[PDB]
């Protein structure tokens, strides 16, 4: 198409650092989960902060998701938001989880991820059946749960269907959290997400997260 | 960093940030049945990575009253996934282990637990007389068996509580001479035992055959001062290792 | 590519990076 | 060879995916599962450190997830509205015979949001013009337009006859009733290297000096009139203006906006309701 | 030489079909007029084997019921209707101002009988739109209309001027009055390696779980409005939409449908009345 | 020893025995600025040590309650030494920075900062309607601001206190995307981000525009048992790297 | 004509059994002809079987 | 055969097999 300024030079292009080149870049980046999301949490820091404490009771739940990338609660993290401007997407995730306790208390967690055609694992027996990382809390906070690419097609939609869905994350206690005297009985665990190195979007669409009124 | 391991079996991985090295019991490591050594002329199932993962026991409580605990291999794991399935339905069959014991404290906390796998653990009954001990009794499942201290029952058929004499009429302190680790709760917060198939046959029966024995065992109490968490759980991941299966049939039934 | 007019900016999407 | 860079471009396979190689089971003191978020880096770990991997070869491609790909669609950016009128002297006045519209994405939040992923972002503008004249009485007329470019400090029209529409120097585009769209390329503009997205900073020192990106570059003014005198019937024209960014370039990602926008320019977010505070679209459970 | 694959492309000569040996009386334990229908193959006897033939150079060609040349053709898939209002609140309406249509191969009988001769199909997707506005008064006013292809989870338009037909991510095709018929293409754009013309499964395990090809690849909306705002004189717009497969590849052929069909994604066949049950062209004799 | 660091800029030099690496934001380390992107044709002033170097910003007490703090670049450093006289006395400059954020404790505390440098960090108002956030308020020098819980004042120049939407009207849980490091209590006691120039122009007024924005938001609360300290300090030091000045004139007078 | 997603990249095409290039090929299979085809038979399986006795 | 668009889905009918 034709220039509506026939002879202009545009301004130098000087170095810039940070250029982003493709939004799969920005995906790769780990960005927290608002994991808590009850209606006393969603206004406040604390939706990105789920409570761990001693147990009396072995083998207890601590938190479940859905690892459907634009799912609730997925879906205002920036690859569930960058998801959301496409159709379908495929590949591997990666959540990590940063244990925030003192270096004084101990714990160890089963993560699972659970694929679909069995609903939200009851127990830990029964998620330890699927994909699973037990986590030894230490001198390194972070541990990483691989949510690999198991699917019948090579895409699922990024919208909620019943054919399309991913299946679950929970995380159980293994062992507990145990602490000496004048520590605290209870810490935060922050959850996180990105994408691994198999991960794509495909069909580009207008986002379901946001919308114009006048 | 010698302190940390992971290990990832299937879809499944442990990790521990805290370790004492690991043991392969007798040096050597779990392999499939060769040619040479083979008796049964079927050719063997090998499930691989659905059966050969991570299965997490029924977690147990130490306290400062806690006497022992042991599980049974395969028996532990007869009710898991797809390897228990496959104990059901053949014949016969052949597996290694990885062992994981996880019990995590504070820099606070004191004890002991040895841990111990027992070729042919052969158990004395809890009773005078010839009477052996029963079926169900040493086929508790994922579960394990607790021992208590001083324990009353009519039941002739159940199991020696006595964890001193190894409940098999040996001393305690003479345990290290099988495959073993501790838990010292000051060094360590896992044990990790990599058992091979150890049997006088290539392959057995499964359900009638408890090839190897897990025993867990408090030497120094658990001790913690006020304010710290009283009580520690213990945890139990097994994953079967190069496991095979021959001589499919009909699922049994108890 | 043929590029039709005088202007470098006149040229349709670039090529990818 | 160009002609591999031309066959990848039309199969839509330049960005290839790394294959998923096959693994095995291991035992080791490394343990690619734990890491330091502290550090600010996301953990390397890929699938095959953590589960037992199959050899996958990966056919996905990135192509559609390119920053070309993602800002060069055509979106709306502009409603630009007059109503035409059968008396001469109304005619010849502002939203009657003609409009003016300052020029920016901030207008249309689907491409606004799109385009603030981003801090700085560089790229030429093809416009395309969808003009919509509904008819308010028994006939249209003759229907021809004039949109003229009128970049800052260049004199805007205040009639719809006045001298300015002369275009002596600003570029203008002419449509007429049935013509195919108006399109046109505005090369990258600004008088710095990249547009500001968004700009910590001020025109001033003062209580009174303006802040944030409507400072560091004023990007002129689009005008619209109706070419044709006054006519029995009247009209509501609405030429709704498309931007599609190309060669493009952007830097320093940000969060996507979390909820409404309020103003142009501003990233200010309190709603004026008293009972209704402002909306994220986190769902609780 | 590619020179003689074009000179047959052109001749529609590139199916070449096996000319008619001469064949002459026999007499032999070879009985190629019998065998086995038992086997589930069809006999391999040809002309040659059971009567006396002529030698025949066959001028025949099968290009034309390649599966390019008989799913290549353009039928229509949807009649889109709206009839607009005078009235500025009615026009703003779904069936007024808009209107909205789920894709589907599955609403017109010509073409989804041809298709489901197959089990799975793959092809890209020409898309051609044939725009007729009936004049209710005595003109037709200026007409502009806007096709948004909406995907699976993009928000769906509620009003003729909501802020989705902003476009800045979907695609968007403008049509007005004389203007060409518009055509785009859409790739083969199933999350599976074909589309399904027919799935014998379910989206769950339930008595509620839906049941067939509707489950295995929602193909996302057309939406089309009138861009022009409310204009004296209605009209009442109907756009129909054609499809022509390209790049086509088809696998598992079935049997055609031999009676009516009742509903979409359904291969359900009873139809509502009591008298008249489920008719076949089987004729009686 | 990957736990220590020592930076030395200048005559002044930091360390830290627990860090947790460092961050070079964008992966592009700070330097002068090349005649190949240059506009303004003076001779820049090069102060180098005297400049280059860090200035510790005052003090802030990290408390169970804090909601967060921030401070512009270059203006929390106007007031500090011969970098503070340059930005007074020049029309233009430019330079990088390196951050190192201070916070100890001991391994009986919990808490978990995030702390971010973003670049435009364009502020939203607290109030509705268009009124943009005032010259004074973005401009907190040395001190910056702290973020308060439900502050009441009737300025509507008074920036957003909404840590959880950035200030800005983008979700906290996304601010990772943005060059950042955690300090997480357990793990390290300090962060350093090292911010290369990052503009779309080569130099800029130092008092108009404030390219980085540091900000510091308690994620996990401060929780410490009683006998600990229920306070402790956020120290904020800063070096300017590579800062270039030009166009000389009187000083500037607010 | 134009792509309506122009940086799209279609799912492979894996292989799948049972391809048809031609309906020639379809045409080439037996199927069963309703030589029966009364008006007792017409709804039924006995509209492809044709009668032989003594 | 030319190709006048940057997507191979937008090419004309494919070559018979
Ligand atoms: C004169 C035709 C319209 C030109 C549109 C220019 C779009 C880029 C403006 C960037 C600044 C902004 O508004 O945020
Ligand atoms: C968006 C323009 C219309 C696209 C038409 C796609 C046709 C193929 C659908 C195949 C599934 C089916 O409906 O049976």
Same mark, same amino acid.
């Given at each position: 198409? %034709?220039?509506?300024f026939p002879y202009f030079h545009p301004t130098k292009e000087i170095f810039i650092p940070g250029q982003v080149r493709n939004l799969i870049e920005m995906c790769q980046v780990d960005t927290?989960? %608002?994991?808590?999301?009850?209606?006393?949490?969603?206004? #406040?820091?604390? @939706?990105?902060?789920?409570?761990?404490?001693?147990?009396?009771?072995?083998?207890?739940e601590v938190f479940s998701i859905p690892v459907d990338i634009a799912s609730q609660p997925l879906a205002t993290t920036l690859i569930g938001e960058l998801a959301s401007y496409y159709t379908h997407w495929t590949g591997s995730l990666r959540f990590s989880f940063m244990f925030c306790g003192s270096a004084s208390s101990t714990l160890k967690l089963l993560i699972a991820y659970t694929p679909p055609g069995v609903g939200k694992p009851k127990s830990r027996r029964e998620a330890?059946?699927?994909?699973?990382?037990?986590? +030894? $809390?230490?001198?390194?906070?972070?541990?990483?749960?691989?949510?690999?690419?198991?699917?019948?097609?090579?895409?699922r939609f990024t919208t909620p269907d019943t054919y399309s869905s991913a299946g679950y994350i929970t995380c159980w206690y293994q062992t507990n959290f145990v602490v000496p005297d004048s520590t605290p009985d209870n810490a935060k665990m922050v959850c996180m997400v990105s994408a691994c190195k198999d991960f794509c979007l495909r069909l580009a669409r207008d986002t379901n997260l946001h919308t114009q009124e006048g | 960093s010698d302190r940390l391991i992971q290990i990832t079996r299937g879809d499944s991985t442990i990790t521990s940030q805290d370790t004492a090295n690991a043991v392969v019991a007798y040096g050597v490591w779990p392999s499939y049945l060769t040619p040479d050594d083979a008796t049964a002329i079927d050719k063997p199932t090998q499930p691989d990575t659905s059966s050969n993962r991570f299965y997490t026991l029924d977690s147990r409580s130490w306290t400062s009253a806690s006497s022992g605990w042991w599980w049974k291999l395969p028996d532990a794991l007869k009710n898991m996934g797809i390897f228990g399935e496959n104990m059901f339905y053949h014949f016969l069959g052949r597996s290694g282990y990885t062992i994981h014991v996880q019990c995590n404290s504070s820099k606070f906390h004191q004890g002991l637990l040895i841990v111990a796998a027992i070729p042919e653990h052969q158990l004395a009954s809890a009773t005078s007389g010839n009477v052996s001990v029963g079926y169900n009794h040493t086929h508790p499942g994922e579960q394990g068996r607790e021992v208590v201290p001083s324990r009353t029952?009519?039941?002739?058929?159940?199991?020696?509580?006595?964890?001193?004499?190894?409940?098999? &009429?040996?001393?305690? &302190?003479?345990?290290? /001479?099988?495959?073993?680790?501790?838990?010292?709760?000051?060094?360590?917060?896992?044990?990790?035992?990599?058992?091979?198939?150890?049997?006088?046959?290539?392959? +057995?029966?499964?359900?009638?055959?408890?090839?190897? #024995?897990l025993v867990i065992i408090p030497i120094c109490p658990l001790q913690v001062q006020p304010?710290?968490?009283? #009580?520690? %759980? /213990?945890?139990?991941?097994?994953?079967?290792?190069?496991?095979?299966?021959?001589? %499919?049939?009909?699922?049994?039934?108890? | 590519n043929i590029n039709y007019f005088k202007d470098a900016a006149s040229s349709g999407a670039s090529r990818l990076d | 060879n160009p002609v591999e860079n031309y066959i990848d471009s039309v199969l839509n396979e330049v960005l290839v995916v790394p294959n998923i190689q096959p693994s095995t089971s291991v035992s080791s003191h490394a343990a690619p599962?734990?890491?330091?978020?502290?550090?600010?880096?996301?953990?390397?770990?890929?699938?095959?450190?953590? /589960?037992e991997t199959r050899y996958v070869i990966t056919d996905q491609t990135r192509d559609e997830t390119s920053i070309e790909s993602f800002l060069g669609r055509s979106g709306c950016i502009a409603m630009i509205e007059f109503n035409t009128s059968s008396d001469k002297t109304e005619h010849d006045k502002i939203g009657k015979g003609f409009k003016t519209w300052k020029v920016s994405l901030q207008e249309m939040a689907q491409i606004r949001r799109k385009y603030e992923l981003f801090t700085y972002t560089r790229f030429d503008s093809e416009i395309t013009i969808v003009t919509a004249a509904a008819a308010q009485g028994n006939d249209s007329?003759?229907?021809?337009?004039?949109? @003229?470019?009128?970049?800052?400090?260049?004199? $805007?029209?205040?009639?719809? +006859?006045?001298?300015?529409?002369?275009? &002596?120097?600003?570029?203008?585009?002419?449509?007429?009733?049935?013509?195919?769209?108006p399109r046109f390329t505005i090369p990258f503009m600004s008088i710095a290297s990249a547009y500001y997205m968004f700009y910590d900073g001020y025109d001033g020192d003062s209580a009174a000096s303006k802040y944030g990106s409507v400072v560091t570059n004023d990007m002129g003014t689009i005008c619209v009139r109706i070419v044709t005198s006054n006519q029995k019937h009247d009209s509501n024209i609405v030429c709704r203006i498309y931007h599609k960014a190309k060669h493009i370039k952007a830097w320093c990602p940000r969060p996507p906006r979390a909820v409404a926008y309020q103003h142009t320019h501003s990233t200010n977010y309190i709603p004026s309701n008293g009972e209704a505070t402002t909306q994220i679209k986190t769902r609780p459970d």
């Open positions: 198409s %034709p220039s509506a927290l989960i %608002p994991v808590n999301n009850t209606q006393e949490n969603v206004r #406040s820091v604390n @939706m990105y902060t789920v409570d761990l404490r001693t147990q009396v009771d072995l083998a207890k330890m059946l699927g994909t699973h990382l037990v986590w +030894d $809390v230490g001198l390194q906070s972070t541990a990483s749960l691989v949510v690999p690419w198991v699917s019948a097609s090579h895409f | 029952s009519s039941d002739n058929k159940r199991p020696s509580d006595d964890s001193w004499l190894n409940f098999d &009429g040996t001393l305690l &302190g003479n345990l290290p /001479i099988y495959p073993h680790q501790y838990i010292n709760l000051r060094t360590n917060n896992s044990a990790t035992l990599i058992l091979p198939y150890v049997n006088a046959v290539p392959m +057995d029966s499964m359900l009638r055959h408890n090839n190897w #024995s304010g710290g968490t009283q #009580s520690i %759980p /213990i945890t139990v991941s097994i994953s079967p290792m190069f496991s095979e299966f021959s001589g %499919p049939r009909s699922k049994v039934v108890f | - | 599962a734990l890491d330091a978020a502290e550090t600010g880096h996301t953990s390397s770990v890929q699938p095959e450190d953590m /589960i007329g003759h229907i021809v337009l004039q949109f @003229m470019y009128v970049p800052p400090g260049a004199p $805007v029209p205040e009639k719809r +006859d006045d001298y300015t529409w002369q275009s &002596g120097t600003n570029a203008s585009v002419f449509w007429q009733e049935g013509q195919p769209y």
